[PDB]
Write a protein that binds this DNA or RNA. Sequence first.
DNA 1: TTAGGGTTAGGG
DNA 2: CCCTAACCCTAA
Length: 55
Amino acid sequence: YTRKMWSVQESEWLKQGVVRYGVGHWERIRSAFPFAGRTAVNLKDRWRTMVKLKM
DNA sequence: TTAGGGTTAGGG
DNA sequence: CCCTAACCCTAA
């Protein structure tokens, strides 16, 4: 498997998920948007990465 | 099922 | 290259 960078839209979905359902509600956020090929753990890790990059 | 530490691969 | 974002491991 070849790792896949996060698109701007995927990151934006995740940000709106945190707004709508709260940090740590990763499985609810995943089901609220058409994430294709991202697990709830993937979202948790991406959020950590976005926090560090200030997004 | 998520939090947090650890791992690795691919792009800057 | 080699650093770091995208991954993995696992307690609770």
